[PDB]
Design a protein around this ligand. Sequence first.
Ligand SMILES: CCCCCCCCCCCC[N+](C)(C)[O-]
Ligand SMILES: CCCCCCCCCCCC[N+](C)(C)[O-]
Lengths: 222, 86, 81, 183, 183, 183, 183
Amino acid sequence: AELDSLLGQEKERFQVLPGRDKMLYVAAQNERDTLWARQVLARGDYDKNARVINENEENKRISIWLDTYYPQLAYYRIHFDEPRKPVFWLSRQRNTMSKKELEVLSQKLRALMPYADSVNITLMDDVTAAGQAEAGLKQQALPYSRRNHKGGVTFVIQGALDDVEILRARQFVDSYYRTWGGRYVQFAIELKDDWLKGRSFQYGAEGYIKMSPGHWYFPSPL
Amino acid sequence: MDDLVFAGNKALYLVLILSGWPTIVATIIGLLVGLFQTVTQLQEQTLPFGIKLLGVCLCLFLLSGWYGEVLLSYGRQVIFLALAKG
Amino acid sequence: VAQNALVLASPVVLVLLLSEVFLGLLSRFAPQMNAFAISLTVKSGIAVLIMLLYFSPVLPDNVLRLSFQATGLSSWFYERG
Amino acid sequence: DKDLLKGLDQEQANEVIAVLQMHNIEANKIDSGKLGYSITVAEPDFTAAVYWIKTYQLPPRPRVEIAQMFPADSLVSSPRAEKARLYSAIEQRLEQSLQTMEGVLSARVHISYDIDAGENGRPPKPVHLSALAVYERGSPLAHQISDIKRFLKNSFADVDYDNISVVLSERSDAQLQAPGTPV
Amino acid sequence: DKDLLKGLDQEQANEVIAVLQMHNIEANKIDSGKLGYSITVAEPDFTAAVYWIKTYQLPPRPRVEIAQMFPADSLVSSPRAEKARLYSAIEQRLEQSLQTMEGVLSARVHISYDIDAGENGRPPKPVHLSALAVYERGSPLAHQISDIKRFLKNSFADVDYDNISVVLSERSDAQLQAPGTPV
Amino acid sequence: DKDLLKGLDQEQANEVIAVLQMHNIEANKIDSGKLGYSITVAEPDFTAAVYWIKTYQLPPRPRVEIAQMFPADSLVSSPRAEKARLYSAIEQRLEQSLQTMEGVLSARVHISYDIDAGENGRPPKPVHLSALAVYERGSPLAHQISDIKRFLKNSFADVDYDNISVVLSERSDAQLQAPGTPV
Amino acid sequence: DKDLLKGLDQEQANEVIAVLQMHNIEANKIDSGKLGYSITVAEPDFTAAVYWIKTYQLPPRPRVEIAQMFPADSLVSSPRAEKARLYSAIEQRLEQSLQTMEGVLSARVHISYDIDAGENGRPPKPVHLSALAVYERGSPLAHQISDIKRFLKNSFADVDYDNISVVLSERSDAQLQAPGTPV
Ligand SMILES: CCCCCCCCCCCC[N+](C)(C)[O-]
Ligand SMILES: CCCCCCCCCCCC[N+](C)(C)[O-]
């Protein structure tokens, strides 16, 4: 009685992989499917050892391990489109490593993932990431402000936003995060009683002058 | 405002309390005499008046004191509420 | 004016009518009972008792709903010149 | 088989079955007539079924409508009660109209009950409206918010596009395959 | 066969049958008379039927109309109740007239109930109207909105074209072929 | 076997079973009909079961709603009692609507009852709202607070984003495997 | 065996058993039906059981709620009684909501009753609140006080963070091992 025969009438929905620790790994696409699988094992419909996995869970677990043994590594995300050959995106500028060090890192990752045959390490450009973020906001025509730090970039979107703006914003952010992960760019959405949508000015003898950003804001009377 | 509502309510409340006992005894005497006149068939009609006059006067004697204490306390209270503002 | 007054007084008139008919019905079993004279002893207490319950709405009822307002001048007066 | 629930009505029973099937729990519905419906599951699945019944707070409660607080049977009706009943009927009629639009599967609507004051002696406040709705998969939600706002705006004497909130969502994936029976 | 629903009314049963057939589920309607109608399906389709009944919130509720909140049976009516019944009857009569236009299959109408205040001591506000309608396939919707607006404008003492909202949609594809029976 | 609790309600028993199962205590539910449900456990687990029942203060109580304090069957309603019932019905209808949003499992809502003064002869104070909600695992809570605030803002005549508090949390780990039986 | 107590409620018996077991005293609960529960212990433990029953003043008294002093079944109500019932129901509804937050086991809330005066002719004083709660082991209490304060602040028309007191504590060690039987 194979495991695939127990998961259901739809077959392609799940993917079964053998691992070097002599254990079966079931790859799922989402939470709902993950629980649909986990019920089978925990019920005890299968006799040997098995485990269920997904992209989000493994990203978390790997990050927890990196936090301990490589506490200063700058990286983005691990993609599992082909679960036998993951792709690990590292920053080109923020990391200094030798080729040898990169190889060792690769081997230790392979030791953490007994279901993977090899891990491909790829270097990505931060300017590229930041640019694609800004272009996506301009393309949606959301109002925003950008702030830069030595280790990251923030976009703040705030004010009395309209329903359409909210919808489009939340869709875009959800899309981008899936590609680049949260580790470098943060998007903050905050509603305020402010019709200027975060712009601010001072009136002097020379007329209007644009204020620097900040925490405090003038709640609109209008 | 609420002082006005409170004082006006209390006025009706005091009317009710003071008048209640005489009207009760005049009721009970009216019922008892009316029944008695059916239990023995007698068609008199001043007998209720004769008895209930004595009944009401007696309880006016009894309550003569509490009547004056209640009204004094109320008068002092409302004079304070009227004048003591600051 | 008469309508408003009746509409507002009604709740007390009803209870005092029911009271007097109730006593008249009771009199059937004891025809020497002066059901009229009993009602005079009772009705004043009943009146004050009931009005004491429905007393507090009197404050809002009059203050706003009955007070005249500047907007009505348009309908009650016009210029003939 | 272990008894989970007894004395259900029809509309509770079917909601419980739906939620269990979604999590791969095979359940059985039995009808006892005057005693209502009963729901049963196998022992290997009992623990899980208990955990989901707790998490989703099943069986569901009945829907609440404001008209239930102000029965017309009362001997006296203030203006406040009549005005409340009126608004509580308009809400239901709008919901039933939105369900007829193209693609909408269900919706809910809310009105600002200023009836919580009589507005006796005060100039009456403007109306505010909110709507929630669910769409078929593959619907351009952004382009459809406009229609809803346009339709609601003219249903009242004074409403501004600024005062109308609209939230839309898509249908989840379809549950078509049956759950597996315990070994 | 598994029981989905019992004690349905005729107009509810035909709605459930229609919705299930659209998704390729063969269903059966049984009549018990005083006990109403029953709906049954095969086991392979039970799960799907449950999920669709949940998703559409079947069986449908009865239709709401504002005159139900203000029955004439009472000896008393304020001006507010009478005025409410009047508008609640005009709405229905307009829908019944629009259904007679060329190509229209169904429609629904809403009027601004300004009676949610008395308009006592105060000038009465202008009327607002909204209408929804469904058309046969191949109808020039753009050129048909004008006719509706023109017709509705004159049904009231004071209405502006700006205050009339109209939303139109086409009939979906016809369900003519019967669903396949489970093997 | 030792008796823990007797004469329980159905909804009141399934909570006890849930809490015990979470701590690896195998329990049994028995039905005596008019006498209700009974809960029993083995002796080796009796001590632990007692400690948990105390710690969680089981069995749970009935849930409270303000309308229970001012029954509509009274002889008279003060304006206070009418206004209270009204608010205590809007609260429930909002909770039932929030549960329909995508991903929300449960929620609770609170409104500022300004009615603790009549506001008669006073300028009425602004409304304040609070909400709690539980989400499915893997939800970006930060990005989802915006939707809730937007939706609640327009449900009332006068509310500022500053006056709305929202607290969100995720579902705990699922209890799927059954507890072990004492040796 | 010596009789300690007779005629207990179910909720009084389980609290007594819990406190005796904590001090290593093996106790027995007996059911006499209409006569309630009885509690018995062995002679070597009798003295200790007596001393602990005195120290904790067992059995517990019933829980007190302000609504009990002003039953809603009265035929008359002052403004003061109505206002009291109102606040006595808000307190309970808040305690019931706090118990749903993450990892809170139990909580208590208190509200400042201004209702003991009409504040007659005076600007009515602002409201004050107090809350107690019990957390699970390993909770960052310091970081969790903020959430509670935030949630309470918006539940009322006028509350300042300065006027809210919050006290938190962790759960004691678990009593899992059974007491030893007297030799
Ligand atoms: C026909 C008698 C009407 C009497 C109404 C006034 C009652 C109060 C009399 C004063 C107090 C009692 N007392 C005995 C001193 O007269
Ligand atoms: C008609 C109301 C009842 C009769 C009492 C009226 C008040 C009379 C004055 C009370 C004086 C009391 N006193 C003698 C202690 O001063």
